[PDB]
Design a protein around this ligand. Structure first.
Ligand SMILES: *CCC(=O)Nc1cccc(-c2n[nH]c(NCc3c(F)cccc3Cl)n2)c1
Ligand SMILES: *CCC(=O)Nc1cccc(-c2n[nH]c(NCc3c(F)cccc3Cl)n2)c1
Lengths: 230, 234
């Protein structure tokens, strides 16, 4: 049903690679080395405009391919660093939050939610991947992780907001992974970037309660982001 | 690019028709009787993109008449699905139906599109139960779904969306069924509104009732409705 014929795949350049599907369509394609490891039955059921769209797979012979939409602006971390306005930055945030809200509603977790692992289409729209979901990247991890539930993605998302409004800085750049994890436990948090209003920082900051059961749901972050957008 | 060769389409039964595209896929097929100049719509369907919009698959333009192919939404239009399934829902599910539509409509509002007839008859429901709206026939007087300023922009749809909430939570009841259209207009001009259905909580109905300010500019945007709704869902 989703089985693509590699006859129909023309390969174009490493970046995971740019390719064409049936000669027409712009696609990105990935080639497994990892083992058997059931993921894609998640990708095949999940369905949201802010997730990287699955086009198909090549399993009927070896090695394996996954084909997705070509997000022509690449990864967000670079896109930030490569012109913006604070409303655009707030949409970028909205986009990720929608995806994550959807994922949250279906009891899934991202587990490495950062700007390098976000992705940007030709229309500037930011999407997240549904491949590799769960059901220790130090600077995106909450206290309870540095010593698997909804609220660690929330922490990660708070930092992603910081990442965005920073135009892509190394978060806590001053410190090592060790000092960062120490300092995080002291109560140190990320300082309000220049480009975020007080209203914005409040969203990102609400993600960083030392207690996971005080942090908002994506549900509420999205609600909070809608609110500011006017 | 979106051109579908009608070789590859089957025409199984009316419902707009159900068919099979390329033999594999379920589809819906709309055949026009309107013009064959007013295609200019379809570029809008082609540029919009959102899960809560009935997804466009393609068209049959090269030859006559015209066809619009969309995804099959196996549970049909919403009004009938409320009534068929009246005893099967739970109040959390009714609110998701609201969320679904509010999402579509927020996207559309964020792109300056108006629906025109936002109402439970014109929404559709897939095998999953998810609710969607058509982006065909947008713009840039169904009496019961219309605000005061229509009966004599963005907030028009808002009013209609309130009645939509009332519809869902009412399990498909005719809004203002006591009254005729002429009556209904007076009572809306009097400030009478739609009462709170059994199944709607205070928070829910507050949200639906916020769509019906006499003053359009005092009505919320779909941004705030979705926020409101997301806010309630916890
Ligand atoms: C950061 C380097 C970079 O910009 N890479 C890049 C550039 C353009 C396009 C992509 C891209 N487009 N689609 C994908 N998909 C990745 C992917 C998944 F996330 C999940 C499954 C399969 C794939 Cl191919 N990357 C990347
Ligand atoms: C209202 C009666 C009913 O139940 N109709 C019904 C039943 C099942 C499926 C559909 C359906 N599925 N897709 C569509 N698409 C409608 C459509 C648009 F909204 C816009 C352009 C083209 C089409 Cl076909 N209807 C309806």
């Amino acid at each position: 049903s989703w089985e693509i014929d590699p006859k129909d795949l023309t390969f174009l350049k490493e970046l995971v690679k740019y390719g064409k599907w049936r000669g027409q369509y712009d696609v990105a394609i990935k080639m497994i080395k990892m083992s058997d490891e059931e993921e894609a039955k998640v990708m095949m059921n999940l369905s949201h405009e802010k997730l990287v769209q699955l086009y198909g797979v090549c399993t009927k012979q070896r090695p394996i391919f996954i084909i997705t939409e070509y997000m022509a602006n690449g990864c967000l971390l670079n896109y930030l660093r490569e012109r913006f306005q604070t409303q655009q930055l707030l949409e970028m945030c909205k986009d990720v939050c929608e995806a994550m809200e959807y994922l949250e509603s279906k009891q899934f977790l991202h587990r490495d939610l950062a700007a390098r692992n976000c992705l940007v289409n030709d229309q500037g729209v930011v999407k997240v991947s549904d491949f590799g979901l769960s059901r220790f990247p130090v600077r995106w991890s909450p206290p309870e992780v540095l010593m698997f539930s909804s609220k660690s993605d929330i922490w990660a998302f708070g930092v992603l907001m910081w990442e965005i409004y920073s135009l892509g800085k190394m978060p806590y750049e001053r410190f090592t992974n060790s000092e960062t994890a120490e300092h995080i436990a002291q109560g140190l948090r990320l300082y309000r970037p220049h480009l975020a209003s007080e209203k914005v920082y409040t969203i990102m900051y609400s993600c960083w309660h030392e207690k996971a059961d005080e942090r908002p749901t994506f549900k509420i972050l999205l609600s909070n982001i809608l609110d500011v957008m006017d």
